[PDB]
Each structure stands twice: as structure tokens, then as C-alpha cells.
Design a protein around this ligand. Structure first.
Ligand SMILES: O=Cc1ccc([N+](=O)[O-])c(N2CCC[C@H](O)C2)c1
Ligand SMILES: O=Cc1ccc([N+](=O)[O-])c(N2CCC[C@H](O)C2)c1
Lengths: 227, 9, 227, 9
């Protein structure tokens, strides 16, 4: 996307979102990142929406195919599951590569740094969902390390109701429950996150209250399913 | 269970 | 897909449908067609489902972008609408090329010939939706000619409740209403098709009755919106 | 109006 203006790539990413063309949206946002400038808050959201939709479709397909393959336990189901898996891994590697070259290293404010480290944890988590054996172990530790650095910054630098802090805690709790075989850690984190946010709601405007309570409900939903 | 949906800007 | 067995391409198309990976499904079915053998009834359905989903997503995106562009009447919205339009045209040309090389010429039974000619009318109709001016005229006549040959065969060779005959009439009526500026022809065709099917329902098994009445309801739904 | 949906085998 090297010949397109940065501002045009951003404009086209917004149009692609409206048209539900998420692969296009991700390509436009990759082009925008590769211009080398830092991303604004809105632009970071566009990058995340684009890739979350792309990898979300891949994960759903991988789960369908993995379930068929397990039931069957010709080569076609395994071969096709492997194809989808390789494509998913390629998208995760692309996102991780954008974060490593050079979004994280240039991110000095807490909001941007926490956002990118949460993304790094998420994309290693998606790699971990399809990994097997020893490579699973190092992938899992990479996810954990990214989430932990993000958590450490968020606790020092953001209020407990900040939506990025809340979403980070939500996703790290999912990591603990689904990836790390640590359901007690997942439950503890979701409970403490919810309780500390509830005690800070009194400080918020009506609009911020809505933003924070929406994510708090997701924490509550998980706690209900896990307990 | 459920992570941040994050599908809509 | 030249190195993959025909039977494996068909198997992978079915898996891709279950995984909602319609671009993959279309590529597998294109590979199967290019093996050069005629397609069975089930295989024809797989080909149609794959491409209808691919072009359906493109048409929905084109409509979103065309509506934004008309509201605005920088170059970005037009440029992006043009990109989507060219991709849509490429998929339609691909399908039309499969039908011309050589599905239609080898299709001798009424069920296969009508099915492919209906597809030919549909894909020219999708080209007509985005065409402007004179090229619109020849595209419209190509759609009309394909639908008309299919209608002529279906009236000679199939009962009035046959689901392909019913779906052909439904789609040709949409062509008349939406493309050809002939709403009276659309209404007449839908009414006559519905009435002739209703008089033939008594001949059908319970399962065939369900198949036919489902499409008859679509004819009725259009008539309600058009009158 | 509505053509054959044709999205599901
Ligand atoms: O934007 C995010 C997005 C988009 C589509 C899907 N999908 O299921 O297709 C998903 N899933 C897939 C994995 C399971 C997860 O709980 C959510 C997320
Ligand atoms: O399988 C067929 C299919 C799949 C998805 C879509 N879509 O709207 O995304 C559609 N539309 C688009 C054009 C308008 C039409 O009435 C139906 C059809």
C-alpha cells in the first residue's frame, strides 16, 4: 500500500468497516502502520477491529474443522484444517510483526503501550489455541509475558474503570481459564477487576459509566459460566 | 469463555 | 487446483461450506469444474452456493459504498467502490467462463441445462446491477436471453412445481422488476408461476410439497411488496 | 425484491 497516502488508507479502512470488508480493512491498516508514524487512539481501534474480525473468522473455521477431524478420529479434513491453521498463523504473525516493527517500541503513553501489549497477548493466545506440545509452551509464555507487562503498566497508570484496563483483564482472565489451565487465577482476576471497577464508578460521567459497565458485564458473564 | 468482542469500531 | 483429485475438491468444498469459507468453497468448485467432467445435481448445488455467497458479499459491499458515494455527490469512496466493483465483475466473469467452458454445452438433461442457464442469467444480472449506459444494454440483453432459453426449456420439460423452474421464474421476475424496468412483466410472471404451481401441488409427496411451497412463498412475498 | 437466497446447500 506504499503508493497510497496515509490519510487515504485510514479513510478506506473506515469505509471497509462500513462495508464489512475486513480483509481489505486489515490491509489498509497494515499499510497505514507501515508509513512509520505512531497511531492515534481512533487508528489503533481501526487496526484492532480489522484484524480481530479477520482472525475471528479463521478461528471459527478452524474450530468447525477441528471438531469434524476429531469426530473422524481420507486426509481431506486434516489437510483443510492445516490449510486454515497456516493462514491463521500467518495473520497472527503479521500482527505480531507490526507490533514488533515498530509500534510497541515507539509507544510511550500508557494508553498506547497497554493497548499494543494487550494485542500482543491476544495474538499469541490465538497462536496458542492451535499449537501443540513444546511450541505451545513458548507461545503460551509469550502471551503471558505480554499480558503481564500490560497489567503492570495499567495498574500503575490507569484508573480501575479504564476500558482498556478492563478489557485487558478480561482477556488475560480468558487466557488463564482457556490456555493456561488456571481457572482459579481466571476467577480471581475477574472478581478483583470487577470489584475494583465498581468502587471507582462514582467518579465517571454518564458516558464513561456506560463504557465501563459494558465491559464489567462481560466479566460478570464469564464468572457466571465459570462458577 | 468470552473475550472482548472487538468486532465493531 | 490441478494437482488435487476431483473427489477431494468436492469433499473440501463441503467442508468449506460447513466452515463458512465461501471463497475457498468457490475455488474448490472451480477446480472441480475444470476437471472437465459433468457435474451431478449435488455438485451443481455446491457450485451455486459457493459463488452466490461470494458475489452476495461483494454486492452488499458495493451497495454500501455506492450509497455513501451518492451521498457525497476526496476520491477515496469512488476509488474503493471501483475496486469492489472490479472484483465483483471478475467473479461474475469467472462463473460465466465456467458456464461457457464448457458446462452449458455439455448439459443435455433439462435439470442441468435449466440450472446452468439460470446461473448465466443471474451472473449477467449481477453485472447489470453495476453497469452504466450502453454496456448496460448488451449485458441486460445477455441476462434476458439466458433466462428466456431456460424458461422455454423449463416449460416444455419440467412440471410447474419443480423447484428449479420456480426459482428460475422468481429470479427472472426480479430481473424484470429491478433491471429491465418492467414491473408489470415481473408481477404477471410471479402471479402466473404461483398459480400454475398451486394447481400442481396435489401431485407431490410431503417432502416435495415443502420444497415447492417454500419457493412459492418467495413469489408471494415479492408480489406483496410490488402490489 | 427477493431472489433465491441460495446461500445454504
Ligand atoms: O471481531 C472479533 C470476532 C469476529 C468473528 C468471530 N467469529 O466467531 O467468527 C469471533 N469469534 C471467534 C473466536 C471465538 C471468539 O469468542 C470470537 C470474533
Ligand atoms: O448466498 C447468497 C447471498 C449471500 C450474501 C448476501 N449479502 O447481502 O451479503 C446476499 N445478498 C446480496 C445482494 C442482495 C441479495 O438480495 C442477497 C446473497
Amino acid at each position: 500500500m506504499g503508493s497510497m497516502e496515509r490519510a487515504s488508507l485510514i479513510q478506506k479502512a473506515k469505509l471497509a468497516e462500513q462495508a464489512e470488508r475486513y480483509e481489505d480493512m486489515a490491509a489498509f491498516m497494515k499499510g497505514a502502520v507501515e508509513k512509520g508514524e505512531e497511531l492515534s487512539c481512533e487508528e489503533r481501534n481501526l487496526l484492532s477491529v480489522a484484524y480481530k474480525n479477520v482472525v475471528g473468522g479463521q478461528r471459527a473455521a478452524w474450530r468447525v474443522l477441528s471438531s469434524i477431524e476429531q469426530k473422524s478420529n481420507g486426509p481431506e479434513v486434516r489437510e483443510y484444517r492445516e490449510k486454515v491453521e497456516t493462514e491463521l498463523q500467518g495473520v497472527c504473525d503479521t500482527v505480531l510483526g507490526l507490533l514488533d516493527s515498530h509500534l510497541i517500541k515507539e509507544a510511550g503513553d500508557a494508553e498506547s503501550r497497554v493497548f499494543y501489549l494487550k494485542m500482543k497477548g491476544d495474538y499469541y493466545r490465538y497462536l496458542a489455541e492451535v499449537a501443540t506440545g513444546d511450541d505451545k509452551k513458548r507461545i503460551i509464555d509469550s502471551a503471558r509475558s505480554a499480558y503481564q507487562e500490560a497489567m503492570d503498566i495499567s495498574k500503575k497508570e490507569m484508573p480501575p474503570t479504564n476500558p482498556i484496563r478492563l478489557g485487558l483483564a478480561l482477556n488475560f482472565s480468558v487466557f488463564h481459564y482457556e490456555i493456561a489451565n488456571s481457572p482459579e487465577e481466571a476467577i480471581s482476576l475477574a472478581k478483583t477487576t470487577f470489584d475494583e471497577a465498581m468502587a471507582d464508578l462514582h467518579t465517571l460521567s454518564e458516558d464513561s459509566y456506560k463504557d465501563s459497565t459494558l465491559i464489567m458485564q462481560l466479566l460478570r458473564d464469564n464468572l457466571t459460566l465459570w462458577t | 469463555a468470552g473475550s472482548i468482542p472487538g468486532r465493531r469500531s
